[PDB]
C-alpha cells in the first residue's frame, strides 16, 4: 500500500472520472445495450468527443449531448421536460451538476 | 491587441466527486428501485454474458 491520503475506493473521492471517453456495453457479445437507436450514437455511450464532427458537444464545455442527457435522467429525471436546474435538495455532494465544472 | 495571434480553442470539464451512472432502465429514468426492464429480465429468463 505504502501510501496515505484520500483513498477513493472507500473515501468517496473520485477525481479521475473525467478521463473517460466512451463506454460500449454489449450483452451476449452481439447486442449493444441501449439498442433501438436510443441515443444520438446508439452504438456506444460517447462520454467525451474530440473531433466533434457534426453537432454533438453539449454545454459550453466538452462532453456529448447524449451523455449529458443520460446523466441528467439518471441523477434528477430532467432531460425530457427541459434542462432546468435541479432543486437544491436534490443537488448533493456526490451528485453530477454539483461537481460538473466547465 | 491588433498584434494578436491566430489561435484555436480547447474545451474540457472536471467532475471531482461523481460516479458516472448508467441506469438499467428503458428510458434512463428512475421510476422505482426495481428498474423498468430489470423486472423484465425475470420472465423465466435465460443467462446473458456482459462485455
Amino acid at each position: 500500500f505504502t501510501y496515505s491520503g484520500t483513498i477513493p475506493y472507500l473515501d468517496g473521492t473520485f477525481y479521475l472520472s473525467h478521463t473517460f471517453r466512451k463506454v460500449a456495453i454489449q450483452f451476449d457479445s452481439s447486442v449493444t445495450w441501449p439498442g433501438n437507436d436510443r441515443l444520438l450514437t446508439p452504438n456506444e455511450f460517447e462520454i467525451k468527443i474530440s473531433v466533434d464532427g457534426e453537432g454533438y458537444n453539449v454545454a459550453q464545455s466538452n462532453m456529448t449531448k447524449d451523455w449529458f442527457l443520460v446523466q441528467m435522467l439518471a441523477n434528477y429525471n430532467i432531460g425530457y421536460q427541459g434542462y432546468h436546474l435541479p432543486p437544491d435538495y436534490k443537488d448533493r455532494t456526490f451528485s453530477f451538476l454539483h461537481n460538473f465544472i466547465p | 491587441d491588433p498584434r494578436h495571434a491566430l489561435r484555436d480553442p480547447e474545451r474540457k470539464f472536471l467532475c471531482d466527486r461523481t460516479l458516472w451512472r448508467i441506469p438499467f432502465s428503458s428510458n434512463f429514468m428512475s421510476m422505482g428501485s426495481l428498474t423498468d426492464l430489470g423486472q423484465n429480465l425475470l420472465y423465466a429468463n435465460a443467462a446473458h454474458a456482459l462485455d
Partner: peptide, 30 residues
C-alpha cells in the same frame, strides 16, 4: 387502549403521524 396514550396530545386529538409513513427506501449507487 388505542395507542393514542403513547403520543403527544395537542389539546385532545393526538399528534399521530401518517399511516403510510412507516417504511423507507433510500438506495442509489451514485
Amino acid at each position: 387502549y388505542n395507542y393514542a396514550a403513547l403520543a403527544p396530545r395537542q389539546g385532545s386529538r393526538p399528534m399521530l403521524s401518517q399511516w403510510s409513513g412507516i417504511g423507507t427506501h433510500e438506495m442509489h449507487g451514485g
